[PDB]
Structure formats: C-alpha cells, structure tokens
Design an enzyme around this catalytic site. Structure first.
Site, PDB file in Angstrom:
ATOM      1  CG  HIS F 202      11.160  81.700  17.005  1.00 11.33           C
ATOM      2  ND1 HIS F 202      11.504  80.762  17.956  1.00 11.33           N
ATOM      3  CD2 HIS F 202      12.270  81.899  16.252  1.00 11.33           C
ATOM      4  CE1 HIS F 202      12.768  80.413  17.789  1.00 11.33           C
ATOM      5  NE2 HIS F 202      13.256  81.090  16.764  1.00 11.33           N
ATOM      6  CB  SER F 206      14.310  83.174   8.884  1.00 11.10           C
ATOM      7  OG  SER F 206      14.657  82.506  10.084  1.00 11.10           O
ATOM      8  CE  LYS F 228      23.454  77.209   3.939  1.00 10.07           C
ATOM      9  NZ  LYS F 228      22.551  77.902   2.969  1.00 10.07           N
ATOM     10  CG  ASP F 229      23.015  76.612  11.359  1.00  6.96           C
ATOM     11  OD1 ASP F 229      22.159  77.014  12.178  1.00  6.96           O
ATOM     12  OD2 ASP F 229      23.087  77.009  10.173  1.00  6.96           O
ATOM     13  CD  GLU F 272      41.939  93.303  22.278  1.00  2.19           C
ATOM     14  OE1 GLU F 272      42.972  93.831  22.771  1.00  2.19           O
ATOM     15  OE2 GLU F 272      41.496  92.166  22.631  1.00  2.19           O
TER      16      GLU F 272
END
Ligand SMILES: CCCCCCCC/C=C\CCCCCCCC(=O)OC[C@H](COP(=O)(O)OCCN)OC(=O)CCCCCCC/C=C\CCCCCCCC
Ligand SMILES: CCCCCCCC/C=C\CCCCCCCC(=O)OC[C@H](COP(=O)(O)OCCN)OC(=O)CCCCCCC/C=C\CCCCCCCC
Ligand SMILES: CCCCCCCC/C=C\CCCCCCCC(=O)OC[C@H](COP(=O)(O)OCCN)OC(=O)CCCCCCC/C=C\CCCCCCCC
Ligand code: HEM
Ligand code: HEM
Ligand code: HEM
Ligand code: HEM
Ligand SMILES: COC(=O)CNC(=O)CCC/C=C\NC(=O)c1ccc(Cc2ccc(I)cc2)cc1
Ligand SMILES: COC(=O)CNC(=O)CCC/C=C\NC(=O)c1ccc(Cc2ccc(I)cc2)cc1
Ligand SMILES: CCCCCCCCO[C@@H]1O[C@H](CO)[C@@H](O)[C@H](O)[C@H]1O
Ligand SMILES: CCCCCCCCO[C@@H]1O[C@H](CO)[C@@H](O)[C@H](O)[C@H]1O
Ligand SMILES: CCCCCCCCO[C@@H]1O[C@H](CO)[C@@H](O)[C@H](O)[C@H]1O
Lengths: 59, 49, 79, 379, 295, 380
Positions: F202, F206, F228-229, F272
């Site tokens: 922040h 972004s 959007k998320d 795994e």
C-alpha cells in the site's frame, strides 16, 4: 582514579562498553554460581546426596 | 539472568529423562537360512542380520 | 503520527534543569524525601484504612461466629 | 528522509508508539500495569507453547502428561510453575489496571475502555479452559459447573451446552476442544490488545490530576521505558518468590486427584480470581438469578462510563468519592473471602449483603455522591 | 546567545549579560561609574594599536606624552587574575508559541584562547560551515548539514561558533527554524557533529582548511579590522600572530587531528542548551544528551 | 471533525482505507486476483483447521485413529477434512501463480512487498510439512523423518539441531505433539506477515500489466475489484470443490493410509506434488550436501530475482524474447515436478539433472543476458 580509568577505557567507547558486559558477565556467572552453590550446600550440610555419597559408593 | 533462562527453556526441548538405556538382543543364526535377511526391532531403529 | 508541536499554545514560561551527570542520584533522603513520604501516608490513611479495618472486623466476626456455632451447647444434653 | 525512524513503514511504528509517544510528564505507577499486562501476555504464551509441546489432550492421558512434563522434561516443572502462576500475576495486574482506570476515570476514553472490558472477559474465559487441561478433579468439576452456566438461558439453553461438551456430559471431546480453545484465545487477546492500545493513542494517556497535559509531555523513552523496566522487576520478584518458594500457595490441592465423574469433592472452591463472581452466583438462591447477578456482576463495567456525574475527571480531588471507592475495593475483598467459605451462616447472609452493597455503590452511591460533590463546589 | 551563556556558565560571572541588569542601570551612580573606570582602565591592561601609513616611533612618542602617570608600587604593575568560570551541562527554555520561529543553541565547554587546539576546532567548524535561506549555493553546497537543511526545509539559518575566552569558551551552533522542523534539524546537526568525531575525511578537511585560510585573511581587510586583530592579539595571545604563522598552523591539520579533537571536546559531553520561541517539537535534555555519542 | 463515519472511525476507517477507497490501476488483470484468493485461502484453512484440531489427538498411539474417527464419526467431519486437505493444494496452486504473476510483470521491483512474499511462501511450505505429519501415516512418518533430517547436512550443529526437532534420538511422540503445536501456530504467523506484505504494498499501489505509471487513471477497489474478485473466487472454487467432492484422493498418495511403521520405509516414495520440484533437485545432485544446497538455493534464489533485473522496461508484455524464456522456465518447472514423480533410474536421472541446471541457468544467466540484449535492440 579507578572510575576515571574505568570511564576512559570502558564505559566510553560504545564498542568496548559492550565488550565489557560480555567478558564481564562471564566472570560474574562463574563466580556467582560458585557462591550460591556454596551458600546452599553449606546451609544443608550432610543432607545432600553429594554428602551421603561415600556410604555406598564402594571405593 | 537472561542467559540462564534461555538455557533453561532451551533444554526443555532436547531429550527427556525417560529416554531408556542400552541393548542386548536374542538371535538364532539358524533362523536365517543360507541367503536371507531379517529385521529386528532394535534400539529404536531396524537392525539387519 | 506526530503529536510533538501540535499540542497546546503556551506563553511566557521559562524552565531550567540540569544534566543528570551534574546532579544527584537521589537527594535529601532525609531533609526532603522521607518527610514527604510521610505526609502522603498521613493524608491518605484516613480515607483508606477505615473501610479496610471495617472489613477485617467483619471477617473475624463472621469467622468467629461460625467456629462458635460448631461447638455444642450443653442445654440440649442436660435432659 | 531525514532519519530512518519516521519514514520506515515498520520501524516508524515502534517509534510512533513506543519511543516518541507523548506521555503526561506525571503518570504514576498505576500506569505501569499496562505494560506488565502486555509482558504478562507475551510471557504466558511462551511458557504456554513450551508446555503445549508436551501435553496430550485426552482424558486417559491428560493428567499423566502434565506430570511426565514436570518430572521428565528438562526444567519442565519450572516451566509449568511460571505458567500456572503467571495466570495469577496476570489477573492481579489486570485488577489494578482496572482500579487505576476507575479511580482516575480513564473510563472516559470509552473505546479504549470497552475493549479493555472485552479483553478481561477473554482472559477470564481463557484461564477457565486452561485450568481444565490438566484434567484434575477440579478441572473436571469446574469444567462441569462453568459450562453448565449457559444452561440457564431458556430454550437454546440445555442445547447450547451440548456443543460445549461435544457430548451429553463432559468427556474427551470436551477436553480436546478446550485445548484448541486455550491454544487459540491468547492470540485473540494479543490481537485485541492491539486495538485497545491503538484506540488509546488517539487521545494520549490520562493522568492523576485529571486535567490537560499538552502543556507538558515527555517521550515514552527513556522516561517511561525506564520507569517500566523497573516496575516489571518490582512485580516480578514476588511472583517469582511464590513460583520458586511456595508453588502451591495459591493452588487448590484437590486438583492433584485425577478427575472422577462420579465423586464431586466436598470442599469445592474455584481458583481465587473467580471467587467474587462465585460469591455472587451463590448469593442469589435461584438458578437464573445467580447467573444473572453474575452476568451483571461483570457486565456492569460497560456502564461505569455512563455513571460518571462528577464535573472533575479523577477522584484525587473528591474525598467523598474516594472513601466510597475504597469502600468498594474492600467490599470486593470480602466477597472474595466469602467465596472461600461454605454455604452456611453467617456467610450466606454476609455474602448476600456484600453483593447488594457492591451493586449499590456502583449503580447509586457513586452517581449520587458525584452530583452532591459538584454542588459543594458551587457548580 | 545570552541565555546560552546564562546557563552554560550559570552561577559564575561569565553568565551575565553585557548590557547588565534592569535594576542596575536604573540605580548605578556617578560614583559607581567612576570606580569602574578607575579600577579597570589601567595602562598595563590597555593596548594602543593602530594600522595605516604611520611610523612606529612617531606613534609611541605620542603615547609617552599623554599616557604617562608612571606607577610606584608593584601592585599597579599587576594583572588581577580572574576566578574560573564553571561550565554546567544544562538547558534553559523560554517559550512563547506566539513567535514566528524558534532559535536553539547548543554548546560544549571551549578550550580557552591560549590552546593550540582552537585551530583544529575552527578547521572543524568550517567543515559544517553555516547556511541561510539566501545562499545561492543551494542543494549543491558542500556542507552536509547545509545540504540536508536545504533538501528538507530544515531551517531559516544556522551557524557554527567557537567563542573563546581567557580561561574557557563556548563551542557549538545556533539555528532558527519553524516550530515544526526544530526536531529533524536539531537531529541532523547533532549527527553532523558526531560525523566529525568519527569519520571526517581528508577531503572534508582539505576544503575546510582553504576556507578558514581565506576567512582569516578577510579578518585583515582594511585598517580597522587589522587594528582589531592586534588589539585583541596582544591582549589575549600576548603578542601578534602573523598570517604566515596562522597559515602554517593550519597546513598542519588533517583528518585524524580533527577526529581526535572533536571527540576530545564533544563526544559524550553534557551540553548547554538554550531554546527560545514556539519550541515544543524539540523537547528533551536527556534525548539530546543521548545524541552526544555513536554516529 | 470529519463528515462521514467511514473516514474518521479509527477502525471502520481501515476497512475503508484498505478495501474500499483503495486506489487501483484501472487495468489490473486476473493474475492480480490470486492475491485475495490466497488470503481467502488462508482464512479458510484456519477455519477447517480449528474445527479439525478439535478432534485430533497428537500422540503416535492415537494419531492415525483420531483422524479416522473424525472422518467416520464426526458430523460432516469427513467433508471438513477434505476441504482442509485439499485447500492446502489450492493454496499452493494459487501461491504459485501469485509468484509467476510477479515474475512476469516484475512486481518484484517492489522489493519489500516481495521479500515478505518469499518469507510467506517459506512459511506456508513449512506449515504444510508439519500439517502432513499429524495423521501419522506411513508417509507422514517417513516424510517427517526425511525432511527434518535435512538439517543434518549442516556441519557441527547438524546432527545436534535435529535432536530438538524430533525431541528425541529418532522420530517419536515428542515429535508428533510438538509438530501439532507448530502447525497450530504457524498459520497465524502467516496471517500476521500477510499484514506486513499487504501493508508494504500500500505505500506504492498495485503494479499493472503495462508496466507504466497509472496515476493517470485509477479506480476504487470497490466495486470494481471487490466484484472482480468475488467472481474470481467462484471461478477457482469450482474445480477445488469438484475435486474435494468428486475425486478426494486424486492428488493424494494412498500409501499414507497405512499407519506409520518405523521399521519399513515404503518402496514407492514421493512427496505430495507441491514438493516435487524441490525433491527432484535434491535428488539431482548425488551428494548429501550438494543436494541440500541445490535445494536450499532452488528456492532461496527468489530473493535474487530483484537484483537480476536488467531490462529498461518493467514487464515482459513488451519483451517477446524474455517472454519465451519465461515460458521456457515454467515448462522447465513442470518437468522437474514430473521427474520428482519418477524413480531414480535412467533416463530420469539425467533428465532431472539437466532440468535443474536449466532452471538455475535461465534465472541466473539467460534472463539477465536476454534482458540486456533486448535494451540494445530498442537502441537504449
Ligand atoms: C556466560 C554469560 C554470557 C552472556 C552473553 C550475552 C551477551 C549480551 C551483551 C550485549 C551487549 C550490551 C551492550 C549494550 C550497548 C548499548 C548502550 O549504549 O548501553 C546500554 C543502553 C543504555 O544507554 P547508555 O547507558 O547511555 O550507554 C552509553 C554507552 N557509552 O540500554 C540499556 O538501558 C540496557 C539496560 C536495560 C536492561 C533491560 C532488561 C531488564 C529485564 C529483566 C528481566 C529478566 C530477563 C529475562 C529474559 C527472558 C528472554 C526470553
Ligand atoms: C476483584 C477480585 C478481588 C481481588 C482483590 C484485589 C487485591 C486487594 C489489595 C488492595 C490493593 C492495595 C492498594 C493500597 C494503595 C493505597 C494508596 O496509596 O491509596 C491512595 C492513592 C491516592 O492517590 P491520589 O489521590 O491520585 O494522590 C495524588 C498524588 N499525591 O490512590 C491510588 O493509589 C489510586 C487507586 C488505585 C488502586 C486500585 C486497586 C484496587 C483493586 C480492586 C479492583 C476494583 C475494581 C472493580 C473490579 C470488578 C470485577
Ligand atoms: C512450481 C511447481 C510446479 C507447478 C506447475 C504450475 C502449473 C502449470 C500450468 C501452466 C499455467 C497456464 C498458463 C497459460 C496462460 C497462457 C497466456 O495467456 O499467456 C499469455 C499472457 C500474455 O499477457 P500480456 O503480455 O501482459 O498481454 C497484455 C494484454 N493483451 O501472459 C500471462 O497470462 C502472464 C503470465 C502469468 C502466468 C504464470 C503462471 C506459471 C506458474 C509457474 C510458477 C513460476 C514461478 C517460479 C516459482 C519458484 C518456486
Ligand atoms: C490483556 C488486557 C489488557 C492489557 C495487556 C492492557 C494494556 C494496556 C496498556 C499498555 C495501556 C497503556 C498504559 C497504561 O495506562 O497502563 C492500557 C491503557 C488502558 N487500559 Fe488496558 N489493558 C488491558 C486490559 C484492560 C482492561 C480489562 C481495562 C478495563 C476494562 C483496560 C482499560 C484501559 C484504559 C482505561 C486505559 C487508559 C489508561 C489511562 O487511563 O491513561 N485495560 N491498557
Ligand atoms: C492467555 C494467557 C494464558 C493464560 C491466562 C493461561 C492459563 C493457564 C491455566 C489456568 C492453566 C492450568 C494451569 C495449571 O495446570 O495449574 C494452563 C494450562 C495450560 N496452558 Fe495456558 N494459559 C495461557 C496461554 C496459553 C497458551 C498461549 C498456550 C499455548 C497455546 C497454553 C498452553 C497451556 C498448556 C499446555 C496447559 C496445560 C498444561 C498445564 O496445565 O500445565 N496456555 N494455562
Ligand atoms: C500467504 C502469502 C501470500 C498472500 C495471502 C499474498 C497476498 C497478496 C495480496 C492480497 C496482494 C495484492 C493483490 C495482488 O496483486 O494479487 C499481494 C501482492 C503481491 N504479492 Fe503476495 N501474497 C502472498 C505471497 C506472496 C509471495 C509468495 C510472493 C512472491 C515471493 C508475493 C509477492 C507479491 C507481490 C510482488 C505483490 C505485488 C502485486 C502487484 O504486482 O501489483 N506474495 N499479495
Ligand atoms: C496454514 C494453512 C494450513 C495449511 C497450509 C494446512 C495443511 C495441512 C496439511 C497438509 C494437513 C495434513 C492433511 C491430511 O491429513 O491430508 C493438515 C492437517 C491438520 N491441520 Fe492443517 N493446515 C493449515 C492450517 C491449520 C490450522 C490453522 C489448524 C488449526 C490450528 C490446522 C489443523 C490441522 C489438523 C487437526 C490436522 C490434522 C488432521 C488431518 O490430518 O486432517 N491446520 N493441515
Ligand atoms: C480457573 O478455573 C477455575 O477456577 C474453574 N474451576 C472452578 O470453578 C472449580 C470449582 C467448580 C465449581 C464451581 N464454580 C463456580 O460456581 C464458578 C462460577 C462463576 C465463575 C466465573 C466465570 C464465569 C464464566 C467463565 I467462561 C469463566 C469464569 C467461576 C466458577
Ligand atoms: C506435504 O508433506 C510432504 O510431502 C512431506 N512428505 C514427504 O516428503 C514424503 C516422502 C519423504 C521422503 C523424502 N522427501 C524429500 O526428500 C523431500 C525433500 C524436499 C522437500 C521440500 C521441503 C523442504 C523443507 C521443508 I520445512 C518443506 C518442504 C520435501 C520432501
Ligand atoms: C530477575 C530474576 C533472575 C532469575 C535468575 C535465576 C537463574 C536460574 O539459575 C539456575 O539455577 C540452577 C540451580 O543451581 C542451575 O542448575 C542452572 O544452571 C541455573 O541456570
Ligand atoms: C510496536 C508496538 C506497537 C504498540 C501497539 C500500538 C499500535 O496505532 C497507531 O496508528 C497509527 C495510524 O494508523 C500508526 O501510524 C501507528 O504506527 C500506530 O502505532
Ligand atoms: C481488515 C482487512 C485488512 C486488510 C490488510 C490491509 C492492511 C493495510 O492497511 C494499512 O494499514 C492502511
């Protein structure tokens, strides 16, 4: 004068101040431990296994 | 004071006191014919004969 | 996050103080220290102690009265 | 730019809340408990993990694991001691930290306070579950009585309890999920503590005189950082003195007997910090009443801020209130004692009274003396 | 600067204003004035100095005629030695948030006129130099503090000083800033001070030297100032120090020299502090003391 | 004072200062979604995690059985495990793209936001490791036995460091219980560092697909990206539920359905999936230490990426060369994974070996080199 010599070669340079607390504490521990152990083993004479030990430790 | 309390707490992690002692085990070399291997639950980890 | 400077508006106040290295660790332990430690104790013991003492009493009574009620009263067996 | 102590999005924080923080040049020692409480928390958590690394939450091994931890783990025993008592030292500190607030009316900083309350509530809960882990006789019977408390609510009552125990009566599922709870809660405390402190920093600390202090403030460091390191060592001495010289003073011994769901012990007392509650719950002879009285006995703290009537902030300058305050304190001391005693005369009546007097001093005597006081200053 | 004296030397005589008190100037008497003149204006303590197109003989000759009045007892040929003035680490804060700016002044005890170290010290004081709003230099100035001062609008002005006296002296700096930058500024400064004691380079000093050099030369720009140099030299150093000398004494100084001296007089010394104005942002002797070591 | 109660409330202001009025490039793609998903992922693992932990019993003689009792007797327990078990994967998947997104668009130039990222990854990696041992299955064990044993590669404090780990002289109860402690704790640490991670981000805003200033046009996270998320979340949630509901054991080894046996290490042993590439590299170098080191660096290299940036531009969008090299790396990774899935034999051994060399090389030399060359071709 000890305090002056002290303040000059020890408590002044932040670098050596530290170097002292270290080498210092060291001695302190070593010494303190001994004392307390002694003050203790003394207040409890003949009651600690370290005292009774020889009555069975075939030697 | 600090150095000792850290030592104290830190050995709290290492091995306990109920961590047993030595071995000694029974084995008949006739239970292993010519050409084979066998596992024996020894001191914690396997043991090949 | 800064609070030093925006606090309040003060005018005409002079303050003087001395480096710690120039003054004493703890001074006048007797000519000033203790005699004040007392004053305080004095002025406050009369608001504090009262109710505490008040409790103490009540505690003992309640306790003493209880241990008393455990003992036996002959007047029930002299018959 | 300039210095890397005010522009670093991280370092700035330790410096914006622990060094340059402006503090009244005059806060006393009753302001220290703040930190201690913090050091107390972080400290419990350490001994806590260390411990949790040897405990085994399961009725058939709970008790024995704690003993093995004491007897076989290197310094284990010590590590328990510190944890077991830290809890007390904790409750002690919190108690003054609350009284400090009452006396000097810090409760006017509503948000900073309310959080505090929540915090208390959590600590209380936290200790409750922790105490049950060793699966001792009290552990059990405690776990059995306390949870049962919710069964006082009608309808969702009996039913809510079921989740708690995870059964139809206290058993394994209870123990294991309590261990989960206990492991988790502390962290939540540490979390809310952050909100608590963060709210406080919008207003600055209150102070003994109850008047503006902008006229003179000082950097937390080194004025209070030093004052606190000392405060810590002055409180740390007794707490260590107990946990090193009289480990079991504060602790009931009945809990050295493995839980027996078949025999509730004759002499049943909760650990000291819950006695006053205990006393009140026992004062009212009604399932619900007792619960309610209890519920309010603590939930009342939320009201203290709306029961302030004095034109001044602290009691320092209100002798009347002061006497009433100390009367309340002592009043509490009694309630505790009463909890330490069985249900019999005189105790029952004494309990009953003390409670009435507790609630009354808070709900009526403080607001009333408070007003009167003003009129005697001519306001 | 008066307050600085007033608490730096606090309690002694040096710690007084030159213009004297309000009460005194209201009551001094013909009498009192007399004595001062009588008791103080005496030949062994006065110096006739001059510069220009004058012959030395021709000058002294006049002296012999008006400055006569020879003395008898040894008493009169004696220079009353003065009582030492005690330096005291401390501060005096005069607040008035109604003032536009704030002035701060920090200092350590100086060495005293005689000491050959004053040279080193001035070499130092040149490294940090001084700055002030109008300096066309700008962000390119060589003085680290000047540079920072500009970069972050730290202060309207600042300056280094090495006030010297018979037996002692003050050594420090004074800056004027807005109520909201006193801090940052103070801080940057105390740092530059430290830098001195810990990492002054041969370049930092090479420049400083050449600067001091020409500063001293401009001290002798005209008759009045040349004269003043003599008046003050004789009276303080006890003779005349030629630029040829002053210069050599400067060519001597190098990094190592400075680092030791500044440490010698600055490092971990309780300072004298005097602040005036809307000075809330700067706020702690301790904190300041704390700024006297490591960096 | 302040008008609305969304900018002056010392709490509400935050949810509004970091989740609503937050300025965002008007053009961030879908590769920016993984950020949130990773968070929802964490917050979700923790829930299923507690719920689970409320029935587990860390103790060799009951570890295995407790998990089955949890599946078989706890209401919906079985489901709750599934979600936790796989969430881990979905978690690693997401994190993986979240890193790739970063590599391609050079978000790594936001050093702090990035470095935290790496620490985060490291923690998650460690976290899953401990979680996996709890069920005390055959792998759990032999996994717990091989992984900790990795510290035994360090000389001097080596063999000795291990001891703390196991809490013994070989894996046993003390190990299990303290692992449960670890596993219980770490997540929270992740949630904590995630706060630092996001908090650093922040300061700068972004990054964005074009790799150029975006101040010239930003939009409120809400409702542009909150919406959007939510969608992104449901688009990923589908497959992950689809597996955890229709093929629970696809990604999971079955060997781990056999209670740990400290006497028999299984013949067909592979970790795994999310640890295969590592595995492959550790297996590529035929030397205790080499393998370890190669491994250590196979991940620790991420810290270098920021200093290995030579292109005058920030994202690859405009650097086809780099791009091809980038996808070459991805695919390179895919192989390494596969190789880990295979036994130590020809050709595999040699294939593994190569792929590793090529991994490290693309990162340490081909990227910086192509990067430069590129600039000169634009005439810079
Ligand atoms: C065998 C034993 C070996 C022990 C090895 C440990 C070595 C650690 C030594 C570190 C070096 C210390 C040097 C610090 C240097 C910082 C400094 O400048 O001084 C200290 C500096 C003060 O500044 P000045 O006095 O002005 O110094 C000016 C120097 N010209 O900071 C201080 O105030 C230090 C003293 C504060 C002590 C606080 C601790 C009190 C708490 C007690 C609780 C007990 C401990 C339990 C610990 C539990 C941990 C999990
Ligand atoms: C709750 C469960 C029960 C637990 C019991 C608590 C332990 C009981 C021990 C009593 C504590 C000892 C206190 C004695 C201190 C005596 C003293 O100095 O008092 C006077 C002094 C005078 O100060 P000023 O008027 O500001 O003077 C200005 C400067 N000249 O007052 C103070 O120190 C402030 C009062 C703070 C102490 C509060 C601690 C009492 C604790 C009880 C908790 C009460 C709150 C309700 C809890 C609900 C649940
Ligand atoms: C690690 C362990 C191994 C795990 C294996 C990972 C799973 C492998 C599946 C591959 C992923 C499928 C991706 C195919 C997408 C194809 C595509 O669209 O590419 C072109 C497209 C073009 O975009 P622009 O140039 O900006 O155009 C501007 C607007 N017109 O590029 C992108 O979508 C951006 C690239 C992001 C994808 C990165 C995902 C790859 C994952 C691998 C992890 C790599 C990092 C290193 C990890 C070290 C540990
Ligand atoms: C884990 C819980 C708690 C911790 C660790 C904690 C810690 C702190 C700290 C660090 C301070 C600042 C210093 C001080 O004034 O002591 C503070 C202040 C404060 N806390 Fe707490 N607190 C806790 C619980 C509470 C509780 C239960 C209350 C009361 C309901 C409370 C009410 C306050 C208030 C009113 C202040 C203001 C201090 C002042 O008057 O200046 N706190 N707390
Ligand atoms: C929130 C602060 C804490 C408080 C107030 C607290 C209090 C307690 C209490 C009352 C007990 C019972 C002690 C006894 O047996 O006499 C206990 C036990 C236990 N606590 Fe905590 N605890 C705290 C945090 C934690 C944490 C953070 C952990 C680790 C997640 C933890 C782990 C344990 C363990 C293992 C036990 C069981 C063993 C034992 O009883 O000694 N505790 N705790
Ligand atoms: C639990 C760990 C992680 C979580 C939950 C997380 C979450 C986030 C979130 C919410 C964002 C913002 C939205 C976005 O751009 O996707 C973010 C950004 C970012 N994260 Fe992470 N992150 C994690 C791990 C990492 C890792 C492992 C890396 C890589 C070492 C990393 C590197 C970054 C970077 C570089 C950005 C900048 C985004 C941009 O390019 O605009 N993060 N992270
Ligand atoms: C940090 C995110 C998390 C990750 C990456 C994760 C991963 C895992 C893994 C790999 C397993 C083994 C699953 C299996 O048996 O197939 C597992 C088990 C377990 N985890 Fe987590 N976990 C997370 C958080 C937690 C948390 C926060 C808790 C609760 C404190 C928790 C509690 C458990 C429990 C009880 C098990 C044992 C039962 C079981 O195996 O299903 N986990 N976890
Ligand atoms: C530290 O743990 C303990 O002291 C618990 N142990 C015991 O109480 C042992 C004796 C059990 C019998 C009766 N207890 C009570 O009636 C009792 C009543 C109220 C409380 C306070 C409290 C309420 C909710 C909540 I949530 C928490 C506390 C605590 C105890
Ligand atoms: C999910 O857990 C697993 O997959 C663990 N189980 C196994 O590895 C099962 C097989 C055990 C045998 C060999 N394993 C390895 O050689 C192995 C090597 C590296 C890694 C990656 C990793 C390193 C540290 C760390 I810390 C974490 C990871 C993981 C495993
Ligand atoms: C402020 C509180 C300081 C506490 C310091 C106490 C240090 C604990 O001291 C311990 O005493 C044991 C008994 O002799 C020794 O066996 C341990 O090695 C030693 O570390
Ligand atoms: C590291 C010690 C932390 C003590 C807890 C107090 C938090 O709260 C404050 O809010 C401000 C505005 O968001 C931040 O800039 C400050 O850094 C923060 O401390
Ligand atoms: C409550 C949701 C918090 C999201 C994390 C972002 C926090 C960064 O937010 C900063 O403080 C501003």
């Amino acid at each position: 004068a000890l305090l002056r010599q002290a303040y000059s070669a020890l408590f002044r340079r932040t670098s050596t101040f530290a170097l002292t607390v270290v080498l210092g504490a060291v001695l302190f521990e070593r010494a303190f431990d001994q004392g307390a152990d002694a003050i203790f083993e003394h207040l409890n004479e003949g009651k600690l296994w370290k005292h009774i030990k020889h009555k069975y430790e075939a030697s | 004071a600090a150095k000792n309390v850290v030592t104290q707490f830190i050995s709290s992690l290492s091995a306990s006191a109920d961590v047993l002692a030595l071995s000694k085990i029974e084995i008949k070399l006739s239970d292993i014919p010519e050409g084979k291997n066998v596992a024996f639950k020894w001191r914690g980890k396997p043991l090949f004969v | 996050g800064i609070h030093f400077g925006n606090l309040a508006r003060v005018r005409h106040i002079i303050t003087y103080s001395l480096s710690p290295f120039e003054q004493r660790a703890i001074p006048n332990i007797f000519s000033d220290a203790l005699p004040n430690v007392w004053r305080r104790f004095s002025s406050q013991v009369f608001k504090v102690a009262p109710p505490f003492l008040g409790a103490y009493l009540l505690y003992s009574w309640g306790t003493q009265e209880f241990e008393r009620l455990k003992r036996k009263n002959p007047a029930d067996y002299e018959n | 730019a300039p210095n890397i102590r005010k522009s670093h999005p991280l370092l700035k924080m330790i410096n914006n809340s622990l060094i340059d923080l402006p503090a009244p040049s005059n806060i006393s020692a009753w302001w220290n408990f703040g930190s201690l409480l913090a050091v107390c928390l972080m400290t419990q958590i350490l001994t806590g993990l260390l411990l949790a690394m040897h405990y085994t939450a399961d009725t058939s091994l709970a008790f024995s694991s704690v003993a093995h931890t004491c007897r076989n783990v290197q310094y284990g025993w010590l590590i328990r001691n510190l944890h077991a008592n830290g809890a007390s030292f904790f409750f002690i500190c919190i108690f003054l930290h609350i009284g400090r607030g009452l006396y000097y009316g810090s409760y006017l900083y509503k948000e900073t306070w309310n959080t505090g309350v929540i915090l208390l509530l959590t600590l209380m809960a936290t200790a409750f579950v922790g105490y049950v882990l060793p699966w001792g006789q009290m552990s059990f019977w405690g776990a059995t009585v306390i949870t049962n408390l919710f069964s006082a609510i009608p309808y969702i009552g009996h039913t809510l309890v079921e989740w708690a125990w995870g059964g139809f009566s206290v058993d394994n599922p209870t123990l294991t999920r309590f261990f989960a709870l206990h492991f988790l809660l502390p962290f939540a405390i540490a979390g809310i503590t952050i909100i608590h402190l963060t709210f406080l920093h919008e207003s600055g600390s209150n102070n003994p005189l109850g008047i503006s202090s902008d006229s003179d403030k000082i950097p937390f460091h080194p004025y209070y950082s030093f004052k606190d390191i000392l405060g810590l060592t002055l409180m740390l001495t007794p707490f260590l003195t107990l946990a090193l010289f009289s480990p079991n003073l504060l602790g009931d011994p009945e809990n050295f007997t493995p839980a027996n769901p078949l025999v509730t012990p004759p002499h049943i007392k909760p650990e000291w910090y819950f006695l006053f509650a205990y006393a009140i719950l026992r004062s009212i002879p009604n399932k619900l009443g007792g619960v309610l009285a209890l519920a309010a006995s603590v939930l009342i703290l939320f009201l203290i801020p709306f029961l302030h009537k004095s034109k001044q902030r602290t009691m320092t300058f209100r002798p009347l209130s002061q006497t009433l305050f100390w009367l309340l304190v002592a009043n509490l001391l009694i309630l505790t004692w009463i909890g330490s005693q069985p249900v019999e005369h005189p105790f029952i009546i004494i309990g009953q009274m003390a409670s009435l007097s507790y609630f009354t001093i808070l709900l009526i005597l403080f607001p009333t003396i408070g007003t009167l006081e003003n009129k005697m200053l001519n306001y | 600067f008066d307050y600085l004296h007033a608490t730096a030397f606090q309690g002694t005589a040096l710690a007084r204003t030159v213009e004297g008190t309000t009460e005194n100037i209201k009551h001094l008497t013909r009498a009192d004035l007399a004595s001062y003149i009588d008791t103080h204006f005496k030949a062994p303590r006065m110096v006739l100095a001059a510069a220009g197109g004058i012959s030395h003989k021709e000058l002294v000759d006049a002296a012999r005629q008006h400055f006569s009045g020879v003395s008898f007892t040894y008493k009169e040929d004696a220079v009353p030695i003065l009582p030492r003035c005690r330096f005291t680490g401390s501060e005096i804060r005069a607040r008035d948030d109604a003032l536009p700016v704030a002035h701060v002044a920090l200092a350590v005890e100086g060495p005293g006129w005689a000491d050959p170290d004053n040279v080193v010290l001035h070499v130092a004081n040149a490294i940090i130099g001084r700055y002030d709003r109008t300096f066309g230099g700008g962000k390119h100035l060589s003085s680290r503090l000047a540079a920072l001062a500009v970069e972050h609008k730290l202060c309207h002005s600042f300056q280094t000083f090495n006030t010297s006296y018979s037996d002692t002296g003050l050594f420090g700096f004074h800056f004027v800033a807005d109520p909201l930058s006193i801090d940052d500024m103070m801080f940057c400064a105390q740092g530059e001070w430290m830098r001195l004691c810990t990492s002054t380079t041969e370049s930092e000093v090479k420049r400083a030297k050449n600067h001091l050099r020409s500063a001293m030369v401009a001290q002798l720009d005209g008759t009045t100032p040349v004269c003043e140099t003599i008046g003050s030299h004789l009276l303080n150093y006890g003779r005349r120090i030629s630029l040829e000398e002053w210069d050599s004494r400067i060519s001597a100084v190098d990094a190592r020299m400075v680092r030791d001296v500044c440490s010698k007089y600055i490092y971990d010394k309780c300072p004298a502090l005097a602040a005036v104005g809307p000075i809330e942002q700067l706020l702690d002797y301790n904190r300041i003391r704390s700024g006297m070591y490591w960096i």
